Curated annotation (Swiss-Prot):
Modifications the protein undergoes after translation, according to the UniProt entry: Channel activity is modulated by phosphorylation. Phosphorylation is increased in failing heart, leading to calcium leaks and increased cytoplasmic Ca(2+) levels.
Cellular location(s): Sarcoplasmic reticulum membrane
Gene: RYR2
Induction section of the entry: By TGFB1.
Swiss-Prot/TrEMBL domain comment: The calcium release channel activity resides in the C-terminal region while the remaining part of the protein resides in the cytoplasm.
Source organism: Homo sapiens (Human)
Protein name, entry field: Ryanodine receptor 2
UniProt tissue specificity: Detected in heart muscle (at protein level). Heart muscle, brain (cerebellum and hippocampus) and placenta.
Length: 437
């Protein structure tokens, strides 16, 4: 009756303002703000329990807070990130074009939480009541949801320093780990530190390297002193797989996976040092000789990494050991780590090879070709042929999934006359029961 009489009733007060310009508009941003807060309280808590752990009293007044953190903050991060993984991976390509662009502030504070969770998990697995594996999975999903390139190209200097230190601390931890295994060959705090290293430190870095690899982007992440830490990491996790020891035998597979991921993630030719002078994007080329004299850098690529041999030499010992057909239990070094090393190397640098880019002649860094991969995969298949009925295991099982990108890369038309070696090595061993590939 009011309407028909003509009086028009509406809302008492129309909108006065709108909160879209604010970056705390996103409940994700606000929740992550509160989250970083509670984790800062957790950090000062863990400093307090580290002070009291050296003290006699192991009783903690903040046990309720410890349980709250571990049972709420730790799993909620994981579930949120595995549910809205695409939201953080918004890389200006507009994924899910309807919406879901994570802000640069969102990503940078996610990276700060990333780093501070790393700092917390550093050497506290004993304090974690068997939930240390849960923190390991948590930082796995953190690394899978990482978006660090945007925040490093545009971000706050504190976030920059945090993201550097996140891998720096792992760098000196692993380094002193290698000095301690070989100095203390004889059979405690150092044992607990090595347990932390093997259980978490290698897998977290491997997850980060896999993230970098399947984004294919991070040639910007690699920066000054980042190459220094990267060569330290390379030589280190390579010497771990090169040396044989009763301690390292158990964790051989983990370090192999980790360094295989590292080879793919690292975007500068780490094995092609003979013609790396042709590269210009190599940050070791970009820093200039002034920065080489200023920083602790040996000024010569050959002295920087002398332990690792040349690519053609390594592949020719691979060829000759394949021809010899030595058993895997005899010397498992190469079959366990070196073959994934190559597989990741070629898989990453195949599109960078001059065969895919006949342009920029004599500006090509890494030299590789289809026949190179064909010979090396022939070596792999002849090795597995030699070790079919010998000692079996799962190392061939995992190197098969590592070599999957190579068999996708190689043309099936080229892998004619190789179809038969594929069905054979499998059809002939009817007496055996193990199945692979």
């Amino acid at each position: 009756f009011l309407q028909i009489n003509g009086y028009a009733v509406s809302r008492g007060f129309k909108d006065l303002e709108l909160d879209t310009p604010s970056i705390e508009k996103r409940f994700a941003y606000s929740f992550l703000q509160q989250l970083i807060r509670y984790v800062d309280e957790a950090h000062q808590y863990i400093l307090e329990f580290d002070g009291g752990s050296r003290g006699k009293g192991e009783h903690f007044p903040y046990e309720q807070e410890i349980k709250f953190f571990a049972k709420v903050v730790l799993p909620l991060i994981d579930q949120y990130f595995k549910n809205h993984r695409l939201y953080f991976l918004s890389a200006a390509s507009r994924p899910l074009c309807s919406g879901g662009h994570a802000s640069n502030k969102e990503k940078e504070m996610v990276t700060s939480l990333f780093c501070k969770l790393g700092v917390l998990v550093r050497h506290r697995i004993s304090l974690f009541g068997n939930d240390a594996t849960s923190i390991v999975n948590c930082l796995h999903i953190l690394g899978q949801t990482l978006d660090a390139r945007t925040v490093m190209k545009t971000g706050l200097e504190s976030v920059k320093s945090a993201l550097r230190a996140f891998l720096d601390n792992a760098a000196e931890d692993l380094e002193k780990t290698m000095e301690n295994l070989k100095q203390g060959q004889f059979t405690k705090g150092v044992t607990q530190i090595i347990n932390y290293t093997t259980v978490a430190l290698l897998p977290m870095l491997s997850s980060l390297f896999e993230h970098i690899g399947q984004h294919q982007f991070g040639e910007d992440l690699i920066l000054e002193d980042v190459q220094v830490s990267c060569y330290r990491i390379l030589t280190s996790l390579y010497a771990l797989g090169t040396s044989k020891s009763i301690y390292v035998e158990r964790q051989r597979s983990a370090l192999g996976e980790c360094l295989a991921a590292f080879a793919g993630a690292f975007p500068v030719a780490f094995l092609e040092t003979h013609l790396d002078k042709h590269n210009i994007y190599s940050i070791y080329n970009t820093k200039s000789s002034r920065e080489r004299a200023a920083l602790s850098l040996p000024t010569n690529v050959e002295d920087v990494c002398p332990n690792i041999p040349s690519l053609e030499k390594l592949m020719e010992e691979i060829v000759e050991l394949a021809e010899s057909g030595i058993r895997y239990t005899q010397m498992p070094h190469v079959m366990e780590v070196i073959l994934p090393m190559l597989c990741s190397y070629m898989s990453r640098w195949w599109e960078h090879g001059p065969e895919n880019n006949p342009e920029r002649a004599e500006m090509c860094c890494t030299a590789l070709n289809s026949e190179h991969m064909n010979t090396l995969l022939g070596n792999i298949l002849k090795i597995i042929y030699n070790n079919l009925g010998i000692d079996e295991g799962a190392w061939m099982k995992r190197l098969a999934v590592f070599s999957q990108p190579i068999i996708n890369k190689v043309k099936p038309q080229l892998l004619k006359t190789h179809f038969l070696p594929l069905m054979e090595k499998l059809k002939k061993k009817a007496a055996t029961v193990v199945s692979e590939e």
